[PDB]
Design a protein around this motif. Structure first.
Motif, PDB file in Angstrom:
ATOM      1  N   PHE A   3       0.803  -1.245   0.000  1.00 40.17           N
ATOM      2  CA  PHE A   3       0.000   0.000   0.000  1.00 40.17           C
ATOM      3  C   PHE A   3       0.848   1.314   0.000  1.00 40.17           C
ATOM      4  O   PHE A   3       0.290   2.422  -0.235  1.00 40.17           O
ATOM      5  CB  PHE A   3      -0.998  -0.024   1.195  1.00 40.17           C
ATOM      6  N   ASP A   4       2.167   1.204   0.286  1.00 38.71           N
ATOM      7  CA  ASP A   4       3.107   2.374   0.298  1.00 38.71           C
ATOM      8  C   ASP A   4       3.559   2.671  -1.137  1.00 38.71           C
ATOM      9  O   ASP A   4       3.887   1.777  -1.933  1.00 38.71           O
ATOM     10  CB  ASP A   4       4.365   2.152   1.170  1.00 38.71           C
ATOM     11  N   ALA A   5       3.627   3.937  -1.458  1.00 38.80           N
ATOM     12  CA  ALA A   5       4.034   4.315  -2.784  1.00 38.80           C
ATOM     13  C   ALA A   5       5.516   4.640  -2.830  1.00 38.80           C
ATOM     14  O   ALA A   5       6.059   5.182  -1.878  1.00 38.80           O
ATOM     15  CB  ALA A   5       3.235   5.480  -3.221  1.00 38.80           C
ATOM     16  N   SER A   6       6.150   4.359  -3.957  1.00 39.83           N
ATOM     17  CA  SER A   6       7.555   4.747  -4.192  1.00 39.83           C
ATOM     18  C   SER A   6       7.611   6.203  -4.647  1.00 39.83           C
ATOM     19  O   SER A   6       6.588   6.770  -5.057  1.00 39.83           O
ATOM     20  CB  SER A   6       8.158   3.858  -5.295  1.00 39.83           C
ATOM     21  N   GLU A   7       8.791   6.803  -4.665  1.00 43.02           N
ATOM     22  CA  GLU A   7       8.924   8.173  -5.186  1.00 43.02           C
ATOM     23  C   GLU A   7       8.543   8.264  -6.662  1.00 43.02           C
ATOM     24  O   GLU A   7       7.987   9.271  -7.102  1.00 43.02           O
ATOM     25  CB  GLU A   7      10.331   8.691  -5.003  1.00 43.02           C
ATOM     26  N   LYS A   8       8.851   7.219  -7.415  1.00 41.33           N
ATOM     27  CA  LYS A   8       8.518   7.176  -8.851  1.00 41.33           C
ATOM     28  C   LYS A   8       7.005   7.202  -9.092  1.00 41.33           C
ATOM     29  O   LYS A   8       6.529   7.925  -9.960  1.00 41.33           O
ATOM     30  CB  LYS A   8       9.124   5.919  -9.474  1.00 41.33           C
ATOM     31  N   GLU A   9       6.275   6.421  -8.301  1.00 37.35           N
ATOM     32  CA  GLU A   9       4.803   6.358  -8.349  1.00 37.35           C
ATOM     33  C   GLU A   9       4.200   7.724  -7.982  1.00 37.35           C
ATOM     34  O   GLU A   9       3.332   8.222  -8.683  1.00 37.35           O
ATOM     35  CB  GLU A   9       4.290   5.226  -7.434  1.00 37.35           C
ATOM     36  N   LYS A  10       4.714   8.358  -6.929  1.00 33.35           N
ATOM     37  CA  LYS A  10       4.245   9.686  -6.537  1.00 33.35           C
ATOM     38  C   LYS A  10       4.530  10.744  -7.570  1.00 33.35           C
ATOM     39  O   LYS A  10       3.693  11.616  -7.763  1.00 33.35           O
ATOM     40  CB  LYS A  10       4.863  10.152  -5.234  1.00 33.35           C
ATOM     41  N   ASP A  48      -3.860   7.210   2.272  1.00 36.44           N
ATOM     42  CA  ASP A  48      -3.611   6.011   1.446  1.00 36.44           C
ATOM     43  C   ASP A  48      -3.382   6.445  -0.005  1.00 36.44           C
ATOM     44  O   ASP A  48      -4.255   7.054  -0.619  1.00 36.44           O
ATOM     45  CB  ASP A  48      -4.855   5.110   1.601  1.00 36.44           C
ATOM     46  N   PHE A  49      -2.222   6.118  -0.564  1.00 35.51           N
ATOM     47  CA  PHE A  49      -1.869   6.579  -1.893  1.00 35.51           C
ATOM     48  C   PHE A  49      -2.758   6.046  -3.033  1.00 35.51           C
ATOM     49  O   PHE A  49      -3.277   6.820  -3.808  1.00 35.51           O
ATOM     50  CB  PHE A  49      -0.434   6.218  -2.229  1.00 35.51           C
ATOM     51  N   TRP A  50      -2.901   4.740  -3.153  1.00 36.13           N
ATOM     52  CA  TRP A  50      -3.686   4.183  -4.244  1.00 36.13           C
ATOM     53  C   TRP A  50      -5.195   4.512  -4.100  1.00 36.13           C
ATOM     54  O   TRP A  50      -5.912   4.654  -5.087  1.00 36.13           O
ATOM     55  CB  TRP A  50      -3.438   2.679  -4.377  1.00 36.13           C
ATOM     56  N   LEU A  51      -5.650   4.712  -2.889  1.00 41.90           N
ATOM     57  CA  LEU A  51      -6.983   5.247  -2.747  1.00 41.90           C
ATOM     58  C   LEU A  51      -7.094   6.750  -3.209  1.00 41.90           C
ATOM     59  O   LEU A  51      -8.135   7.159  -3.743  1.00 41.90           O
ATOM     60  CB  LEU A  51      -7.458   5.089  -1.304  1.00 41.90           C
ATOM     61  N   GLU A 254     -16.224   0.812 -14.168  1.00 44.45           N
ATOM     62  CA  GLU A 254     -15.565   0.710 -15.483  1.00 44.45           C
ATOM     63  C   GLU A 254     -14.291   1.562 -15.598  1.00 44.45           C
ATOM     64  O   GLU A 254     -13.589   1.465 -16.586  1.00 44.45           O
ATOM     65  CB  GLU A 254     -16.532   1.113 -16.607  1.00 44.45           C
ATOM     66  N   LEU A 255     -13.983   2.404 -14.609  1.00 41.90           N
ATOM     67  CA  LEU A 255     -12.782   3.222 -14.693  1.00 41.90           C
ATOM     68  C   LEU A 255     -11.545   2.389 -14.379  1.00 41.90           C
ATOM     69  O   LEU A 255     -11.642   1.341 -13.720  1.00 41.90           O
ATOM     70  CB  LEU A 255     -12.852   4.394 -13.725  1.00 41.90           C
ATOM     71  N   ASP A 256     -10.386   2.869 -14.823  1.00 38.29           N
ATOM     72  CA  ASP A 256      -9.142   2.150 -14.612  1.00 38.29           C
ATOM     73  C   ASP A 256      -8.521   2.656 -13.315  1.00 38.29           C
ATOM     74  O   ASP A 256      -7.589   3.476 -13.321  1.00 38.29           O
ATOM     75  CB  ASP A 256      -8.178   2.298 -15.786  1.00 38.29           C
ATOM     76  N   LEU A 257      -9.071   2.162 -12.214  1.00 38.58           N
ATOM     77  CA  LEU A 257      -8.762   2.676 -10.907  1.00 38.58           C
ATOM     78  C   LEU A 257      -7.490   2.108 -10.328  1.00 38.58           C
ATOM     79  O   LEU A 257      -6.993   2.650  -9.394  1.00 38.58           O
ATOM     80  CB  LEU A 257      -9.936   2.424  -9.943  1.00 38.58           C
ATOM     81  N   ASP A 258      -6.959   1.040 -10.894  1.00 33.35           N
ATOM     82  CA  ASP A 258      -5.777   0.393 -10.355  1.00 33.35           C
ATOM     83  C   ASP A 258      -4.458   0.854 -10.974  1.00 33.35           C
ATOM     84  O   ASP A 258      -3.394   0.279 -10.695  1.00 33.35           O
ATOM     85  CB  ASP A 258      -5.922  -1.125 -10.498  1.00 33.35           C
TER      86      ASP A 258
END
Length: 261
Positions: A3-10, A48-51, A254-258
């Protein structure tokens, strides 16, 4: 944890926000805790990042793109907040939003966490979208004043102080869609607009039922006047906008939420 994001993802999300919020709408959407400053409660938890990613896409799909589809980009920009902050919360029980100011206009803060069911349309409207449409409507009213005759329709029945002591069954017969709509005309018209845009048909009809023979015509008159105002002042077809919002909030899964991109 996964659930933790990397610097690249952010940085990828920052890039996506630049392109989807900042450039088209001049909205600063903030999720990083280090850039957010506010009062807090014991309910505060890490954001939460992905949320945050899911919510940024849901908010754009169900409000920003809806307004664009029906009123055009200029309309959307005319009632947009300046800043949206996401802050993490342990639950929904201490409220799900706050409002403030930033850079001369509106700041909206949304409290979120994985207690959220993102596809539950009633819950997303209850926690977030109802109040948002209400505030956007209010900005529209500031820029282009609504007809002064709206204020007369329920003159005599407003309770600017004490509105919260009247329930729905009491206020609907007086032509108020919610207790809060019974406070002041400027809140009444923001509520009619926000309820009309977010209530499914059955919920709206339930209000009309509680309104009975006295209140139904009063609500009908207010709604016709709002429709006319949105048409004359903003070239927006409000019934169409209601339908477009409903279509869009049913499309959430239907959205690309992931993924970000």
């Amino acid at each position: 944890s996964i659930f933790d994001a990397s610097e690249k993802e952010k940085s990828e999300f920052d890039r996506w926000l630049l392109e989807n919020y900042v450039n088209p709408y001049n909205i600063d959407f903030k999720y990083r805790m280090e850039h957010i400053e506010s009062d807090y409660t014991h309910n505060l938890v890490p954001t939460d990042f992905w949320l945050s990613v899911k919510l940024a896409k849901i908010v754009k799909h169900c409000w920003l793109e809806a307004y664009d589809e029906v009123g055009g980009l200029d309309f959307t920009r005319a009632c947009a907040p300046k800043v949206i902050h996401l802050i993490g919360s342990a639950s929904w029980d201490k409220g799900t939003y706050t409002l403030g100011t930033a850079e001369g206009g509106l700041k909206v803060t949304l409290y979120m966490g994985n207690w959220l069911d993102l596809t539950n349309v009633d819950r997303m409207n209850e926690y977030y979208f109802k109040v948002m449409h209400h505030e956007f409507a209010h900005i529209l009213h500031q820029k282009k004043n609504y007809p002064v005759d709206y204020d007369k329709i329920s003159a005599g029945n407003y309770t600017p102080t004490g509105w919260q002591n009247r329930k729905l069954a009491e206020v609907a017969p007086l032509g108020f869609v919610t207790p809060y709509a019974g406070s002041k005309p400027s809140e009444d018209i923001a509520e009619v607009t926000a309820c009309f845009l977010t209530y499914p048909e059955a919920q709206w009809e339930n209000v009309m039922t509680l309104a009975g023979e006295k209140g139904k015509p009063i609500i009908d008159q207010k709604l016709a006047m709002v429709k006319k105002y949105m048409k004359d002042s903003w070239q927006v077809d409000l019934d169409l906008l209601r339908k477009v919002i409903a279509r869009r909030t049913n499309e959430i899964s239907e959205l690309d939420l992931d993924h970000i991109y």
